[PDB]
């Protein structure tokens, strides 16, 4: 089974950029838009869970609405010469009527819509 195109709109679309210094937390924004007539459930995933704090990391976007997801890069030891293998992904699914975690649990993979972003470190 093939996966369906992403329903949400993403800003940025492909790239999450983090500019140093990395002494303090570096927050970058990921705006998710729901331009549809139905509420859309979303979950944020990443290849480096312990390096970030994502607020919110999941939830529901109302119809015709937009959410600012704060991707927070925790302070670390930056090596300019190392390439950030860090990636993110937004999974989405249509919220069933009159409705959570029980929904995600029984969601088959083609029911999920994926969008991947790559993390870029500068300075």
């Amino acid at each position: 089974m093939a996966k369906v195109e992403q329903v949400l709109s993403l800003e940025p679309q492909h790239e999450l950029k983090f500019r140093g210094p990395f002494t303090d937390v570096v927050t970058t924004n990921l705006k998710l838009g729901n331009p549809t007539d139905r509420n859309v459930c979303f979950k944020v995933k990443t290849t480096v869970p312990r390096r970030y704090c994502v607020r919110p990391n999941s939830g529901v976007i109302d119809a015709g609405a937009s959410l600012n997801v704060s991707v927070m890069l925790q302070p670390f030891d930056y090596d300019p010469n190392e390439k950030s293998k860090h990636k993110f992904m937004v999974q989405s699914m249509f919220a069933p009527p009159d409705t959570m975690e029980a929904v995600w649990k029984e969601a088959k993979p083609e029911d999920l819509m994926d969008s991947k972003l790559r993390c870029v470190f500068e300075l």
């Binding site: 995933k45 704090c53 999941s58």
Partner: peptide, 9 residues
């Protein structure tokens, strides 16, 4: 390959 995990809060 590069497995994705649920992001932490």
């Amino acid at each position: 390959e590069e497995e994705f995990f649920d992001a932490h809060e």
